[PDB]
Design a protein around this ligand. Structure first.
Ligand SMILES: c1ccc2sc(-c3cnn4cccnc34)nc2c1
Ligand SMILES: [Cl-]
Ligand SMILES: [Cl-]
Ligand SMILES: [Cl-]
Ligand SMILES: [Cl-]
Ligand SMILES: [Cl-]
Ligand SMILES: [Cl-]
Ligand SMILES: [Cl-]
Ligand SMILES: [Cl-]
Ligand SMILES: [Cl-]
Ligand SMILES: [Cl-]
Ligand SMILES: [Cl-]
Ligand SMILES: [Cl-]
Ligand SMILES: [Cl-]
Ligand SMILES: [K+]
Ligand SMILES: [K+]
Length: 530
């Protein structure tokens, strides 16, 4: 009875609001839940931190409570929590995570700095252990891991440049400046290995500055795209002036593990789109090539968030031994006005239909198999079905809209994936958008609704939906740290952002019911087509 109600309360998503009755109830069975790590956050939510006496007893129970998982500690860094001890406790719990998991959360943790003590961040500048705040922790971990240092720098530099924040929230703007100042300071006071990282960061910044200047200069050629391409390739050739073809092996901001010698001038060209982004081939240290897209005049931060979340969702699926052949390509804003994207060799589905008439034709042309399904390589088909299922569930959870055949891309190995996430969290250029985004071309690609593939596709959809639901706490916690970020589709309804994602998980349904729900969603989406 009562215990049953308590179990339901602790089972609530981290972002669900407890009623007054639910809160007073939790406060009553405090000592009866100290050994339930998943209940710690619910107790903390039910404490009046404005009352000295109340907070004192609460902090005491914190010390005797079974430590909470790192995934749940993210909740404490949200704006909801202002008690320094709780926030310090959250950092102590985050310290228990390795750098691979920490990097999965860094984007959100940089936003969570908005909820930290600004004066402490500033005062730190030269004129469970709980001595480190978030800023100190991130800087500490970055000094030990150049990959974390890379993303910390760029994530924070972008927030420093944000002119919206500068005008509307000068205090927050200054804080991020102070964060950058604290970072530089720590680097200059570190070991030889640490200090060199600072100059590497500076080398990256100047390279990006010269690339930006290059893009503007290309736009000085008033000719057609061919003429602009010739201007681009010519300017890239002059390392004396642009200094972008021969550099001192600096980490690639988009992917710091990749060291680059410069950009191949002769293979650089501009896309035929309004902003004319450039496809650039970086020369890597081992003689290889890393193709990127560099876009100027666009805020990539919404795309950056979605691809960071898709990367996380892929890793989660992979952890559960489910590889759905996803394409979490890398995105890095280098400013609110420009950034990099990892280029994935592929062809938009609209172009596939224009040139080959169908996905299946395309597959047969490049991946034929006599005994394969519909004369298509079984491996390619298996990749297509899995990637279809993965993105079908992922785009559904994230509420991605504006879905057409030009932002649905396909590789010759069978990988299908989505790009250009200008519409997320339920927004769409059109009203009454389909809840699930499963077009006829996709279903035809796998052999139609009568094909076994289809059935397998739904099976994969079920599996993925159940797996991701298990991580709804982590995913919702990360989104909760984004509610105040300068992201268009979040800024529109900040208060409703987490709810919109939470509802997609249908955590009110059991696993069995959730599979039925997914099936319905798939079947009705296919019926609409039909
Ligand atoms: C024709 C027209 C437009 C595009 S954008 C594109 C592409 C490849 N990787 N990637 C990663 C992110 C965004 N976009 C891409 N391929 C084409 C082909
Ligand atoms: Cl009530
Ligand atoms: Cl109380
Ligand atoms: Cl703080
Ligand atoms: Cl570095
Ligand atoms: Cl402020
Ligand atoms: Cl250097
Ligand atoms: Cl441009
Ligand atoms: Cl191109
Ligand atoms: Cl053009
Ligand atoms: Cl990314
Ligand atoms: Cl193409
Ligand atoms: Cl955008
Ligand atoms: Cl809409
Ligand atoms: K990839
Ligand atoms: K078309």
């Amino acid at each position: 009875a009562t215990r049953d109600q308590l179990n339901i309360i602790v089972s609530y998503p981290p972002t669900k609001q407890l009623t007054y009755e639910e809160q007073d109830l939790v406060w009553k069975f405090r000592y009866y839940l100290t050994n339930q790590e998943k209940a710690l956050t619910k107790f903390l939510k039910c404490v009046n931190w404005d009352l000295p006496q109340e907070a004192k007893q609460a902090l005491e129970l914190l010390g005797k409570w079974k430590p909470m998982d790192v995934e749940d500690s993210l909740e404490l860094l949200s704006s909801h929590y202002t008690n320094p001890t709780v926030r310090r406790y959250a950092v102590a719990r985050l310290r228990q995570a390795d750098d691979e998991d920490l990097l999965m959360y860094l984007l959100q943790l940089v936003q969570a700095l908005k909820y930290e003590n600004f004066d402490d961040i500033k005062n730190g500048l030269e004129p469970e252990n709980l001595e480190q705040d978030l800023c100190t922790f991130l800087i500490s971990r970055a000094c030990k891991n150049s990959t974390l240092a890379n993303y910390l720098y760029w994530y924070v530099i972008v927030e420093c440049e944000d002119q919206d924040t500068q005008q509307r929230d000068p205090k927050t703007h200054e804080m991020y400046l102070n964060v950058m100042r604290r970072f530089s300071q720590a680097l200059l006071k570190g070991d030889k290995s640490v200090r060199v990282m600072r100059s590497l960061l500076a080398a990256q910044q100047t390279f990006v500055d010269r690339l930006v200047h290059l893009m503007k200069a290309v736009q000085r050629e008033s000719g057609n795209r061919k003429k602009k391409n010739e201007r681009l390739q010519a300017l890239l050739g002059d390392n004396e002036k642009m200094n972008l073809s021969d550099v001192e092996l600096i980490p690639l901001p988009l992917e710091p593990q990749v060291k680059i010698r410069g950009i191949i001038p002769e293979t650089a060209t501009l896309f035929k789109s309004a902003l004319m982004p450039a496809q650039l081939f970086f020369k890597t240290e081992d003689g290889g090539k890393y193709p990127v897209i560099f876009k100027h005049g666009d805020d990539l931060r919404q795309d950056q968030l979605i691809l960071q979340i898709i990367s996380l969702m892929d890793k989660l699926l992979r952890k559960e031994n489910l590889d759905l052949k996803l394409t979490p390509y890398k995105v890095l804003a280098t400013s609110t006005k420009h950034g990099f994207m990892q280029f994935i060799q592929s062809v938009p589905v609209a172009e596939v239909l224009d040139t080959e008439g169908s996905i299946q034709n395309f597959f047969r042309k490049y991946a034929p198999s006599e005994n394969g399904p519909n004369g298509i390589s079984a491996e390619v088909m298996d990749t297509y079905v899995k990637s279809c299922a993965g993105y079908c569930v992922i785009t559904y959870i994230l509420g991605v809209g504006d879905r057409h055949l030009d932002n649905l891309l396909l590789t010759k190995t069978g990988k299908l994936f989505h790009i250009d996430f200008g519409y997320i969290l339920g927004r769409d250029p059109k009203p009454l958008p389909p809840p699930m985004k499963l077009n006829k071309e996709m279903v035809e690609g796998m052999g139609g609704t009568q094909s076994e593939q289809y059935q397998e596709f739904r099976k994969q959809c079920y599996t993925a939906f159940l797996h991701l639901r298990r991580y709804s706490n982590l995913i919702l916690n990360l989104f909760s740290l984004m509610v105040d970020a300068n992201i268009p589709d979040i800024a529109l309804e900040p208060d409703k952002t987490v709810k919109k994602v939470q509802d997609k998980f249908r955590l009110d349904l059991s696993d069995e019911e959730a599979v039925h729900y997914m099936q319905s969603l798939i079947d009705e989406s296919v019926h609409a087509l039909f």
